[PDB]
Amino acid sequence: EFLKPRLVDIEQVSSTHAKVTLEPLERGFGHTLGNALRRILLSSMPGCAVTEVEIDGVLHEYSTKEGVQEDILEILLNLKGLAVRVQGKDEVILTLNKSGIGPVTAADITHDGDVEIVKPQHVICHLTDENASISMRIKVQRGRGYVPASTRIHSEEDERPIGRLLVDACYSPVERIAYNVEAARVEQRTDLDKLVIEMETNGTIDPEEAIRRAATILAEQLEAFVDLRD
Template identity: 40%
Template sequence: MLQPNFKVTTKDTGVNAAQIIIEPLPQNFGHTLGNSLRRILLTSLEGGSATSIKVDGVPHQFSTLSGLREDILDLILNLKTVNFAIDTDEIKNVKLHVSGEKEIKASDLDCPTGVTVTNPDKVLCHLTSPKAKINAVITVARGMGYVPAEEHTSEEIGVIPLDSSFSPVISASYTIEATRVGRSTAFDKIKLQLVTDGSITPLDAFKEASRLLTDYSAYVNSEEAYLIEVKPKASTLATGGYVDDLDLPTRVLNALKKADIVKLSDLKSLSLSDLHKVKNLGEKSAAQVVEKAAEKGITIA
């Protein structure tokens, strides 16, 4: 049996970026492990994102706001690129209250406790006159994967639902190289390139993906994962059916029904001699009835 015996090393390659190396692995385990980790990293980690926005004086996303250089749609597109780190499962409201001529950045957002912005230099919009102002409430939440705006709709007038990409991982890719153990080169090395949005470090994202993979793999090997099919008892099946279920010739079925043998439960009370007394039911036909009844768990003797 192959036992895991490898090491994991990390190397920072940029802002919120790292290379994670896993070696040595048995040959062909590189793609098995690397692809599983990559898919989990890209699809199954929780992160934070804006889910809706309400701007004073703006009825819908195709509106404009006096004194705002961008239209509301541009503001929404910029807002979608703001990375929120949220340490609670509660839905939170982030406020934006700015007036006067100003370039508005993500750092101008007033975040409640438990919510931080990891890219504060992101430009959201521009106010173009001293009398211009913008007042907005942005709803943020934790989630997983991509959620379309239709799932964030609200009955409140003026609330604009947003498409949300919750994944904290921007990119994840891997390569497989041969590595040496002693004289043998029949081992794999995984080089995993990982970039996050700053709400989680690459190493923490890797550890969380590894934990999820371990949990699901362990569950597959647990008793709880397997359903034991309980087959109904033959007697239960028999009493609930009809003689039509026996797949007998029409002539034989008609003979049984004329003798008021309609249900399978009627057959259970018969003996072989009783069956021979049924009018128009010869010995060969009686043998067919006995054989088909036995398939349903009914013994006629």
């Protein structure tokens, strides 16, 4: 009859690349599980991302600042890719404060105990003025999917402050998923296959936790079909 696939060794190709394997899976179930998990991962994972950036120097997205090789436009574009995970608070306000010439990177942000920057060498900007200071108040919060910064503006009829810049928030920890089903040989019965899922994620989610959350979402969705109300 049935034998449940069991999680086996989760190796780390890199801090962003992980392969999770399910060895004891019956024939005909490999592609089903792989497709379902891939869709859930690219669809329903929670993640931390930036929404509001409050740069002291500039007033709007299209105004440049002194001593930077990058427009505030690219400041927001690079802050979009900020790989960050939060644990206790669903919403946090990171503070970046740096003066002097040099490439201002992600590690330069004042990191709290509830916030971990999994990408420290991520370049934010380049401060080319010997005595200018860059001060950012970056709002990073939890979410799912992709919310363009054009929906919360309708919820309050334009942001009351002017210094806050809205960034389209992509709460997608995973950006690449593939699954391969291979003919496994095991003492368990004679007909089982192994499913290997290779994952490129921003490193802000544990691969085991990602798979567990995906399976939880799949089960909660299948709950309705398991028990038909009518």
